[PDB]
């Protein structure tokens, strides 16, 4: 095997879509979502590498 399927996942709407108040309460947790997207994009670059 050489490569695997790249994937990306939103934190925000996957946790809670359409609810603005849920996003308000989620913003009280900091920047977990940015770290997760960073990890996935690191994998995404790494496959092409």
């Amino acid at each position: 095997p050489v490569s695997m399927t790249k994937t990306s996942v939103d934190c925000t709407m996957y946790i809670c879509g359409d609810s603005t108040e849920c996003s308000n309460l989620l913003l009280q947790y900091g920047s977990f979502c940015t770290q997760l997207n960073r990890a996935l994009t690191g994998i995404a670059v790494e496959q092409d590498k």
Binding site: S8, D10, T12, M13, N37, T41
Partner: protein, 49 residues
């Protein structure tokens, strides 16, 4: 929110951004109107009797 370049600047927390590609702003078609549906439920209670 002035232009997508400012969105990238504001989400990477810098004023200069080096050359490449970045993933920001998941969007959605923003639903426009309300609707409610219930059956043709006409079987009334005898208030007249």
């Amino acid at each position: 929110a002035l232009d997508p370049l400012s969105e990238t600047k504001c989400t990477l927390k810098s004023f200069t951004v080096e050359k490449g590609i970045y993933q920001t702003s998941n969007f959605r078609v923003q639903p426009t109107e309300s609707i409610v549906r219930f059956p043709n439920i006409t079987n009334l209670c005898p208030f007249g009797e």
